[PDB]
Amino acid sequence: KIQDSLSSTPSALGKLQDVVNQNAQALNTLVKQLSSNFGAISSVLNDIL
Amino acid sequence: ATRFASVYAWNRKRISNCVADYSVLYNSASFSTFKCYGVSPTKLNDLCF
């Protein structure tokens, strides 16, 4: 039943999917903040220099 | 240009697909005020637009 429930139901692993997802969102959010301008003339550091 | 357009109907000459020798702008002294926002007023030659 564990084999079938985990293979079939994607939300069954939500407690682990949320931690991996929060880390993926935290790093993806951090990189999108590297894509965020924050009030500067440009968000890209190599072009600013 | 020998003659330019007036300030209400100012011309708009788009430049593309060539090499832009910004040296004639950077080293020139006839420009009374070169007070330049956005990018550095001297080292224009090291960017692609």
From Swiss-Prot, chain B:
Domain of life: Viruses
Effect of R3K: In strain: Mu/B.1.621
Effect annotated for changing L25I: In strain: Omicron/XBB.1.5, Omicron/EG.5.1
Record annotation: effect of changing S28L: In strain: Omicron/BA.1
Consequence of substituting S30P: In strain: Omicron/BA.1, Omicron/BA.2, Omicron/BA.2.12.1, Omicron/BA.2.75, Omicron/BA.4, Omicron/BA.5, Omicron/BQ.1.1, Omicron/XBB.1.5, Omicron/EG.5.1
Subunit structure, as described in the record: Binds to host ACE2. RBD also interacts with the N-linked glycan on 'Asn-90' of ACE2. Cleavage of S generates a polybasic C-terminal sequence on S1 that binds to host Neuropilin-1 (NRP1) and Neuropilin-2 (NRP2) receptors. Interacts with host integrin alpha-5/beta-1 (ITGA5:ITGB1) and with ACE2 in complex with integrin alpha-5/beta-1 (ITGA5:ITGB1). May interact via cytoplasmic c-terminus with M protein. May interact (via N-terminus) with host bilirubin and biliverdin, thereby preventing antibody binding to the SARS-CoV-2 spike NTD via an allosteric mechanism.
Described function: Attaches the virion to the cell membrane by interacting with host receptor, initiating the infection. The major receptor is host ACE2. When S2/S2' has been cleaved, binding to the receptor triggers direct fusion at the cell membrane. When S2/S2' has not been cleaved, binding to the receptor results in internalization of the virus by endocytosis using host TFRC and GRM2 and leading to fusion of the virion membrane with the host endosomal membrane. Alternatively, may use NRP1/NRP2 and integrin as entry receptors.
Protein name per UniProt: Spike protein S1
Species annotation: Severe acute respiratory syndrome coronavirus 2
